[PDB]
Design an enzyme around this catalytic site. Structure first.
Site, mmCIF file in Angstrom:
data_model
loop_
_atom_site.group_PDB
_atom_site.id
_atom_site.type_symbol
_atom_site.label_atom_id
_atom_site.label_comp_id
_atom_site.label_asym_id
_atom_site.label_seq_id
_atom_site.Cartn_x
_atom_site.Cartn_y
_atom_site.Cartn_z
ATOM 1 N N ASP A 181 0.834 -1.190 0.000
ATOM 2 C CA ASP A 181 0.000 0.000 0.000
ATOM 3 C C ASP A 181 0.874 1.247 0.000
ATOM 4 O O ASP A 181 1.870 1.325 0.726
ATOM 5 C CB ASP A 181 -0.917 -0.007 1.219
ATOM 6 C CG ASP A 181 -2.168 0.810 1.007
ATOM 7 O OD1 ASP A 181 -2.278 1.474 -0.044
ATOM 8 O OD2 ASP A 181 -3.045 0.780 1.894
ATOM 9 N N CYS A 215 -7.850 -1.767 -5.513
ATOM 10 C CA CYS A 215 -6.894 -1.973 -4.436
ATOM 11 C C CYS A 215 -7.669 -1.861 -3.129
ATOM 12 O O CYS A 215 -8.775 -2.403 -3.023
ATOM 13 C CB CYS A 215 -5.754 -0.959 -4.519
ATOM 14 S SG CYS A 215 -6.247 0.691 -5.085
ATOM 15 N N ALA A 217 -8.479 1.344 -1.715
ATOM 16 C CA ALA A 217 -9.348 2.471 -2.018
ATOM 17 C C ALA A 217 -9.744 2.549 -3.485
ATOM 18 O O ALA A 217 -10.679 3.284 -3.818
ATOM 19 C CB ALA A 217 -8.674 3.785 -1.612
ATOM 20 N N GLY A 218 -9.058 1.825 -4.365
ATOM 21 C CA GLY A 218 -9.346 1.915 -5.782
ATOM 22 C C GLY A 218 -8.845 3.172 -6.455
ATOM 23 O O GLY A 218 -9.446 3.611 -7.441
ATOM 24 N N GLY A 220 -5.028 4.466 -5.681
ATOM 25 C CA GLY A 220 -3.576 4.513 -5.668
ATOM 26 C C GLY A 220 -2.914 3.484 -6.558
ATOM 27 O O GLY A 220 -2.418 3.814 -7.641
ATOM 28 N N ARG A 221 -2.887 2.230 -6.102
ATOM 29 C CA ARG A 221 -2.343 1.160 -6.931
ATOM 30 C C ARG A 221 -3.196 0.947 -8.176
ATOM 31 O O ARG A 221 -2.665 0.698 -9.265
ATOM 32 C CB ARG A 221 -2.229 -0.127 -6.112
ATOM 33 C CG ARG A 221 -1.121 -0.093 -5.061
ATOM 34 C CD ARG A 221 -1.228 -1.239 -4.060
ATOM 35 N NE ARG A 221 -2.220 -0.975 -3.024
ATOM 36 C CZ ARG A 221 -2.388 -1.723 -1.942
ATOM 37 N NH1 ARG A 221 -1.641 -2.791 -1.716
ATOM 38 N NH2 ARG A 221 -3.327 -1.389 -1.061
ATOM 39 N N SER A 222 -4.521 1.062 -8.039
ATOM 40 C CA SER A 222 -5.405 0.956 -9.196
ATOM 41 C C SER A 222 -5.074 2.015 -10.241
ATOM 42 O O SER A 222 -5.012 1.723 -11.441
ATOM 43 C CB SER A 222 -6.865 1.078 -8.755
ATOM 44 O OG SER A 222 -7.249 -0.014 -7.938
ATOM 45 N N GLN A 262 -1.402 7.788 -5.888
ATOM 46 C CA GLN A 262 -1.451 8.419 -4.576
ATOM 47 C C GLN A 262 -0.110 8.953 -4.087
ATOM 48 O O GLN A 262 -0.091 9.718 -3.118
ATOM 49 C CB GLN A 262 -2.007 7.435 -3.541
ATOM 50 C CG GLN A 262 -3.522 7.368 -3.513
ATOM 51 C CD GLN A 262 -4.152 8.654 -3.018
ATOM 52 O OE1 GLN A 262 -4.168 8.930 -1.819
ATOM 53 N NE2 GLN A 262 -4.676 9.451 -3.945
HETATM 54 O O1 LIG Z 1 -4.988 0.674 -2.044
HETATM 55 C C1 LIG Z 1 -4.393 1.647 -2.554
HETATM 56 O O2 LIG Z 1 -3.412 1.478 -3.365
HETATM 57 C C2 LIG Z 1 -4.852 3.034 -2.156
HETATM 58 O O3 LIG Z 1 -4.967 3.965 -2.983
HETATM 59 N N1 LIG Z 1 -5.149 3.201 -0.789
HETATM 60 C C3 LIG Z 1 -5.588 4.385 -0.128
HETATM 61 S S1 LIG Z 1 -5.916 5.797 -0.672
HETATM 62 C C4 LIG Z 1 -6.330 6.653 0.555
HETATM 63 C C5 LIG Z 1 -6.249 5.846 1.717
HETATM 64 C C6 LIG Z 1 -5.776 4.397 1.275
HETATM 65 C C7 LIG Z 1 -5.542 3.165 2.208
HETATM 66 O O4 LIG Z 1 -5.466 1.976 1.690
HETATM 67 O O5 LIG Z 1 -5.412 3.326 3.456
HETATM 68 C C8 LIG Z 1 -6.598 6.421 3.034
HETATM 69 C C9 LIG Z 1 -7.398 7.664 3.082
HETATM 70 N N2 LIG Z 1 -7.116 8.632 2.016
HETATM 71 C C10 LIG Z 1 -6.765 8.107 0.713
#
Ligand SMILES: O=C(O)C(=O)Nc1sc2c(c1C(=O)O)CCNC2
Ligand SMILES: [Cl-]
Length: 298
Positions: A181, A215, A217-218, A220-222, A262
């Site tokens: 993550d 991922c 949150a859908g 960052g990695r996504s 992200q």
């Molecule tokens: O799973 C990912 O690659 C991803 O974007 N994760 C994200 S984005 C994001 C969070 C997270 C998390 O997993 O804690 C926490 C709150 N703000 C944005």
């Protein structure tokens, strides 16, 4: 490559944070009022990660049609994706309802269920052939048919059945298991090897619905996976690596879902993956076997 010359400049000047911040400041800002309705509070994994109203996937339910998921429609590349959060314990039925209603055949999972001691995603698929899952709220049944475990990713063959009609479909699950993550894949080779397994399965052929990418949150990695995939598809269609503006593609994708990619290093990895992937597109197929060996699948 105009893109690898730009990469050298940014590296030498240490501008990745500045470049990435510029993208955050220019990114689209659209309302998400359905996602923010009180009755949908427990359908969102993160309060700060919501789908735009204009591009959200609607469930074909008359009760509550909301799922935290967005349709990324890349017009020029002629490819669409559905990006969504890792399902919650109460939205796993919604997740597979979306998969059914959108006619998806592939699910790309870039996270693990537990990361850094936290439950970043519900266990939404069966881990044992003989222990199928039934989602009572959406009348769906899910069975593990087989799985192919490699050192850093797993491919699963799932059977999804609509219990109302008894119609069944095969769903392929592409699970990248070593992508931290807020981090990057171990190498461009590891990432591109996995991407080839996804593309070669046929899951993204246009007679199917859009592939689902998620991922935790859908975003960052996504977003990292989807930016690299779209950029490579574009330069494949054109056979012209210099015609692809990666930052412009990212800004276009962020019209459809917020926060794609992200960290600045994820942006940097996207460049490296696209630059390395250009080798195969421009006619060096042996690099695919190089990536497989460099990824250490076994
Ligand atoms: O799973 C990912 O690659 C991803 O974007 N994760 C994200 S984005 C994001 C969070 C997270 C998390 O997993 O804690 C926490 C709150 N703000 C944005
Ligand atoms: Cl969870």
């Amino acid at each position: 490559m105009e893109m690898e010359k730009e990469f050298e400049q940014i590296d030498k000047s240490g501008s990745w944070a500045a470049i990435y911040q510029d993208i955050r400041h220019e990114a689209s800002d659209f309302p998400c009022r359905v996602a923010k309705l009180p009755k949908n509070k427990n359908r969102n994994r993160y309060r700060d990660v919501s789908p735009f109203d204009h591009s959200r996937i609607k469930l074909h339910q008359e009760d509550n049609d909301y799922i935290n998921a967005s349709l990324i429609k890349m017009e020029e590349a002629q490819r669409s994706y559905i990006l969504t959060q890792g399902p919650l314990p109460n939205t796993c039925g919604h997740f597979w309802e979306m998969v059914w209603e959108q006619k998806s055949r592939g699910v790309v999972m870039l996270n693990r269920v537990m990361e850094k001691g936290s439950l970043k995603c519900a266990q939404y698929w069966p881990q044992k052939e003989e222990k199928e899952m039934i989602f009572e709220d959406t009348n769906l049944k899910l069975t593990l048919i087989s799985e192919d475990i490699k050192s850093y990713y797993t491919v699963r063959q799932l059977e999804l059945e609509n219990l109302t009609t008894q119609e069944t479909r095969e769903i392929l699950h592409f699970h990248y298991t070593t992508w931290p993550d807020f981090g990057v894949p171990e190498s461009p080779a590891s990432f591109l090897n996995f991407r080839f397994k996804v593309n070669e399965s046929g899951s993204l052929s246009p007679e199917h619905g859009p592939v689902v990418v998620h991922c935790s949150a859908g975003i960052g990695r996504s977003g990292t996976y989807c930016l690299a995939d779209t950029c490579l598809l574009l330069m494949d269609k054109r056979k012209d690596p210099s015609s692809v503006d990666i930052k412009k593609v990212l800004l276009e994708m962020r019209k459809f879902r917020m926060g794609l990619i992200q960290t600045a290093d994820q942006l940097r990895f996207s460049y490296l993956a696209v630059i390395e992937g250009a080798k195969f597109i421009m006619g060096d197929s042996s690099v695919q076997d190089q990536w497989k060996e460099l990824s250490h699948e076994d």
